[PDB]
Design a protein around this ligand. Structure first.
Ligand SMILES: Nc1ncnc2c1ncn2[C@@H]1O[C@H](COP(=O)(O)OP(=O)(O)O)[C@@H](O)[C@H]1O
Lengths: 370, 269, 278, 188
């Protein structure tokens, strides 16, 4: 079909979607499905039992919020089908999922079976005429307009560093570690339990997420700030209460630099970027060190890039040009790049056609997608 | 014969890390007048000794090589029986026995077995030690590995106030093999070396040995990490870059569209 | 003091273990060291013959632009390996790395049909999966048995990037017509030394068989077994690299302890953890 | 909290206990009249013998179904209306959020303590629940010593009676020097 393409960003925590051509996406809703906890008694109650979007945000006190995508992988395909249907519902697109081209992002280095099942869903359930899959880094450099660089984005389920050379991600140097903002939120919940303000509920877990997104900053000094006694910056709960956070508002975002705090064999974001550039050839290290874009939602901490610069100075070679760019449209760099790659005239040949998939299978997609 | 020494070191640099000991002996057998000139910068595996009176193990290097004997830190005795060796400071002997204790804990936490040793010696305004760690692979298992670690540390203690300057130099001499059906035999040599220096404050809760423990821990984490990703991924990249699995003319299609998008990205500049 | 005859075994030991793309450097570090070019001339000359006959050395043929490989399975003494492609004999200086005397080899005729047949099919295969590959097929009536010794070699010698690597592959296409037990070896040696030193040495003792049905059928079928084993082997090697942070290294040294935390050095030194109590 | 939920069920039975010095009688009932059903639902679909209970006052209370569903709360906090987990899920999550190389050792060594682990049929139901959550053919072993009420105290008697305890405590002088930070520093 010759209509406008639909760019969908499978965010691990915030699924971002909409038609191509639009600069800023006008349809953003979190990636979760909530079911009512309490028993309905009174007639004329809510109808549906499956809430997604702003309805779930308004009725948080009823839904048992569960996530369908953890660390990039999809653990519940039924819920992802329902969210994909909600994208085509009467609140986000108001069209069909069988008469428009579809662009689906994914985290890099994902297992083959995820792309396989996603193809099965988007071609059997949805009768998508044109489907193309891509990465969440290539699109971010496309949005920033640069040619070569290293994309360090951090979704709610992954923090991957990708060095891209002239619009293409080198598969020989992609770094990926299962750590992100959601784990920081869980770590933050653990400290709040270590402070008294325990929130042991999934419907109440998004309040901890709001605390993460509003009163958490990274500290430059890893020890002087640790030994401090802060002013205990208060925060208001969504009911009218107050929380004196104190010494845990900065220790919680420290998980992104040392995953030993949670006890997981991995490396910090700065170390991930260092290894992502050092895995590549010598011919580009000088350019990659001077071309770093901080995409991803989780990279919005107050002081993230500053401590990254300090850690890269401690790890990269002698006084090399370390330029890290902080785009203000960081939250939707991948979607903007999706609109760029979807509105191309050359894009008419990269999507795997419906007939090709139905008569060949996902192996044809793996032999054709990139 | 100085150029001969430079080419000799480069020969050891390119020598296969499977027969380091034998080939080092051979290279010494060429010019034996340059023998104990090479046994200072040519990395080779360690030597396991045997403390008879204690029933422990202790590694061998040049720092414990007192004369031509070895100071067993589990007993502070020399083997061969040299009763004329250079005993460490009694102060440092106590610091050394607790050092050996702490690194046995370290070794047991990460290596789950293996042999370790920590020797010590002076400095005018401090002291200096070496940390030997040798973990051979599980003999019962088929993974024939041999982790080897040497950590040259030099504590340059400041004037007073208990603040120091910890200089550290490390070395890891890896060794690996798997007799897996998918790979046949996959041998894997390798060696690293780094340096790091920090000035952590000394205290009653933070002694020198604890600072050294944190440095050795961080250093080995960086080396094991750095190895695994950078170097080993580099080797995987080399094998993938040599021969590709995808059929060519298919790669011409993907590289064709790749160059098309190269033109597309460098088209809207 | 060491005699002179032992120096031959020494130089042979240093040449037979030289990594690919780094032979000349081993030669410089052995020429400026052994100090007698006559001793290493004879001994190392035999070692050069070994090191260049075994590793499927890429030799350039100036007449037909083919860059054939010198395989151990074909020779007539004074570096007179018989080039199967173009039917030309040739001399070759192991050190100069330049062939000589492209005399049109009057081959006795062993399996020349199979030679260029399986060679052709392997040329297609090399042009499919090998970037800088090279094929060479030796046809020989070895000890009363017709065999094809198809060899594959690819390499990358990039000294500016501090690495090398030489995919070597041999496939004894044993033309034992009722059951071609195609048993060969795919040895790989990869070196990398940027700010360190890492060496990958591997090989798979491939064992497979098929009846020699026809020529073109077993040519492309030989390629079928080859593409099978090679895709299998390269992929498997990559996944061995994938499962190494948690299995092989954990046999040597874990990334984090079993308690999944760092070390409280203050705790261990301050007091005994209770290890005295059991 | 199990006693509190038991109080709610006693009200639903008809017997009311709401005085603060009567909540203790509810605790006494929990301590000598409750048990744990092996099958959580099969026993709920039956009418038990409804044993009596003598109050300190001298009255009589027939309990009925309010004796097995009362300590059922520990394995399902949905009855109290909470997104928490049961005891079995606390064990399985505590074991699974650890190093994979220690799971078998942890499943072969489970120790119970605390007074709430004294209900009848507690350990047996815990074994059934853990078997439903542990991977197949892994030896599960739950120990249950006779001093679950005194486990932490006896452990304190063994720990503090050692010579290393001198170096393990916090001195008063140290507390006056550093403060609370000294306690968090030497918290273990
Ligand atoms: N002000 C903020 N501070 C910290 N984190 C934030 C802030 N705003 C948004 N986030 C984080 O953005 C993340 C959303 O991930 P996102 O980047 O949208 O996934 P994707 O990139 O895959 O679409 C959440 O983890 C949330 O913590």
């Amino acid at each position: 079909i010759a209509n406008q393409p639909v760019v969908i960003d499978n965010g691990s925590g915030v699924i971002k979607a909409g038609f191509a051509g639009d600069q800023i996406p006008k349809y953003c809703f979190p990636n979760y499905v909530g079911r009512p906890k309490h028993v309905r008694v009174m007639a004329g109650a809510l109808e549906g039992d499956i809430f997604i979007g702003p309805k779930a945000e308004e009725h948080r006190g009823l839904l048992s919020i569960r996530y369908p995508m953890e660390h990039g992988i999809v653990k519940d395909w039924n819920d992802m089908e329902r969210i994909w249907q909600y994208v085509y519902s009467k609140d986000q697109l108001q069209t069909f999922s069988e008469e428009h081209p579809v662009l689906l992002t994914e985290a890099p280095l994902n297992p083959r079976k995820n792309r396989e099942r996603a193809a099965e869903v988007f071609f059997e359930t949805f009768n998508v005429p044109a489907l193309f899959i891509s990465m969440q880094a290539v699109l971010s450099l496309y949005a920033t307009g640069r040619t070569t660089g290293v994309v360090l984005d951090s979704g709610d389920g992954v923090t991957h560093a990708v060095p891209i050379y002239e619009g293409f991600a080198m598969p020989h140097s992609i770094m990926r570690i299962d750590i992100a903002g959601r784990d920081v939120s869980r770590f933050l919940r653990l400290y709040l339990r270590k402070e008294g303000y325990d929130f042991h509920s999934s419907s109440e877990f998004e309040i901890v997420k709001a605390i993460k997104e509003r009163a958490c900053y990274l500290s430059i000094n890893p020890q002087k700030d640790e030994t401090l006694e802060t002013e205990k910056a208060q925060y208001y709960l969504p009911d009218g209460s107050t929380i004196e956070i104190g010494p845990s508002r900065f220790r919680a975002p420290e998980l992104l630099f040392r995953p030993d705090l949670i006890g997981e064999e991995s490396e910090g974001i700065h170390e991930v970027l260092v290894f992502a550039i050092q895995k590549s050839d010598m011919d580009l290290r000088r350019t990659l060190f001077s071309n770093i874009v901080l995409s991803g939602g989780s990279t919005l901490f107050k002081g993230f890039g500053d401590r990254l610069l300090s850690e890269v100075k401690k790890l990269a070679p002698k006084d090399v040009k370390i330029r890290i760019s902080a785009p203000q449209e960081r939250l939707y760099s991948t979607w903007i790049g999706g609109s760029i790659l979807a509105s191309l005239d050359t894009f008419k040949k990269m999507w795997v056609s419906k007939k090709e998939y139905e008569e060949d299978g996902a192996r044809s997609i793996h032999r054709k997608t990139f | 014969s100085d150029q001969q020494l430079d080419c000799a070191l480069d020969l050891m640099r390119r020598l296969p890390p499977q027969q380091i000991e034998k080939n080092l002996s051979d290279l010494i057998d060429l010019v034996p007048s340059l023998c104990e000139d090479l046994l200072s910068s040519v990395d080779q595996p360690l030597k396991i000794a045997r403390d008879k009176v204690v029933g422990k193990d202790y590694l061998l290097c040049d720092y414990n090589r007192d004369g031509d004997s070895y100071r067993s830190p589990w007993s502070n005795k020399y083997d061969p029986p040299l009763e004329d060796g250079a005993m460490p400071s009694a102060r440092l002997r106590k610091l050394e026995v607790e050092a050996n204790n702490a690194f046995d804990q370290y070794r047991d936490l990460y290596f789950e077995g293996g042999v370790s040793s920590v020797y010590l010696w002076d400095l005018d305004h401090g002291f200096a030690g070496v940390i030997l760690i040798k973990k051979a692979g599980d003999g019962s298992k088929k993974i024939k590995g041999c982790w080897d670690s040497i950590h040259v540390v030099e504590v340059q203690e400041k004037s007073s106030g208990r603040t120091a300057h910890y200089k550290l130099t490390s070395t890891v001499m890896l060794w690996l093999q798997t007799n897996k059906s998918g790979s046949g035999t996959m041998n894997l040599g390798g060696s690293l070396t780094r340096q790091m220096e920090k000035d952590e404050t000394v205290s009653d809760c933070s002694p020198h040995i604890a600072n050294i423990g944190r440095l050795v821990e961080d250093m080995e984490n960086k080396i094991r990490s750095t190895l695994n990703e950078i170097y080993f991924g580099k080797t995987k990249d080399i094998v993938n870059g040599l021969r590709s699995v995808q059929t060519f003319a298919d790669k011409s299609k993907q590289e064709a569209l790749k160059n098309d998008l190269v033109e597309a990205l460098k088209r809207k500049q | 003091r060491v005699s002179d005859e032992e120096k031959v075994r020494i130089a042979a030991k240093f040449i037979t273990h030289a990594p690919p793309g780094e032979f000349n450097e081993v030669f410089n570090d052995v020429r400026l060291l052994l100090n007698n070019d006559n001793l290493l001339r004879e001994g190392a000359a035999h070692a050069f013959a070994q090191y260049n006959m075994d590793q499927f050395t890429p030799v350039k043929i100036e007449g037909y632009e083919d860059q054939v490989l010198i395989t151990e399975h074909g020779d007539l003494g004074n570096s007179r390996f018989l080039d199967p492609r173009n039917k030309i004999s040739f001399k070759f200086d192991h050190l100069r790395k330049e062939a000589s005397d492209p005399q049109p080899e009057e081959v006795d005729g062993s399996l020349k049909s199979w030679r260029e047949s399986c060679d052709s099919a392997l040329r297609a295969y090399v042009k499919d999966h090998y970037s800088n590959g090279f094929c060479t097929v030796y046809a020989k009536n070895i000890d009363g048995q017709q065999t094809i010794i198809a060899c594959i070699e690819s390499h990358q010698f990039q000294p500016k990037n501090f690495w090398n690597g030489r995919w070597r592959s041999e496939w004894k296409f044993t033309i034992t017509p009722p059951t071609a037990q195609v048993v060969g070896v795919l040895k790989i040696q990869v070196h990398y030394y940027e700010d360190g030193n890492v060496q990958l040495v591997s090989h798979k003792d491939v064992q497979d068989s098929v009846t020699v049905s026809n020529e073109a059928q077993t040519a492309k079928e030989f390629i079928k077994i080859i593409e099978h084993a090679e895709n299998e082997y390269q992929t498997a090697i990559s996944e061995n690299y994938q499962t190494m942070s948690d299995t092989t290294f954990k046999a040597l040294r874990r990334q984090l302890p079993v308690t999944r935390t760092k070390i409280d050095w203050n705790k261990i030194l301050s007091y005994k953890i209770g290890k005295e109590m059991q």
